[PDB]
Design goal:
By secondary structure, the chain is α/β, with parallel strands linked by helices. It folds into 2 domains: 196 residues, 5'-nuclease (Rossmann fold), CATH 3.40.50; 77 residues, DNA polymerase, domain 1 (Orthogonal Bundle), CATH 1.10.150.20. The chain is 44% helix and 10% strand. Strands 3-2-1-4-5-6 form a 6-stranded mixed beta sheet, sandwiched between helices. A hairpin with a 4-residue loop joins strand 5 and strand 6. Helix 1 crosses helix 2, helix 2 crosses helix 3 and helix 5 packs across helix 7. The longest helix has 20 residues. The relative contact order is 0.15.
Length: 284
Amino acid sequence: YKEGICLIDFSQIALSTALVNFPDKEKINLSMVRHLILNSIKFNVKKAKTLGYTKIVLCIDNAKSGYWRRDFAYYYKKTWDWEGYFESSHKVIDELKAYMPYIVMDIDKYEANDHIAVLVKKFSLEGHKILIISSDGDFTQLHKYPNVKQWSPMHKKWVKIGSAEIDCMTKILKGDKKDNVASVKVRSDFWFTRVEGERTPSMKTSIVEAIANDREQAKVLLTESEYNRYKENLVLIDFDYIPDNIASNIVNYYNSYKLPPRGKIYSYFVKAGLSKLTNSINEF
């Protein structure tokens, strides 16, 4: 009928796992990274498939040339062997596109959250049941779509939250410092060009919720200055405001993707000296 689909926020999961597993102040090589990635995939694909989600799509963060969102906001998104990791991870990903039986969503200037957001939308409306593997609360924006569950890999629990509308609107109005997205109360590039004497004016929860439950209320509860910022942040926070062309590109990338026959798997594992895994290919 309609195959269950698991969408894995993979860039987050891989790195997050690496940070926790790879000790600080030690070199990270292509071998360590390969083991960790493939093992992470095995442990997660097993969770997905065991639940009826059999079509696995990996979504990667790619900011080599930046972010398509910077087209609207230039300010958007402006020890440990970080270099060693990214270096080896970028090379293992290419091996995934080559041998592994997964659709790897990888487009320059496109974020994993984009592919997920678009694909979760496309296939939820096509009658499929969708499992999002991620701890990112932002995906609660998609929990509104039918047959959409989210599984936090690290803490091994489900993500259940209408209260998602409030969550979304909060970031839309108050911004998200982690991405340099600013409040509507201040100038767009506040986080990038902030002077020391400055800080952001607060946003009353009443107004946030009022607008959240009814967005037409942004026209009356916000000033013209704040309402202009609102319309900006929408493209930066709300998945619905992902430009059609971006989604169109994402979908087309998914459609045209050619999977490698599972025969390449075994030969690959051995090639990479992963013999202690060729007996678990049935789990990939």
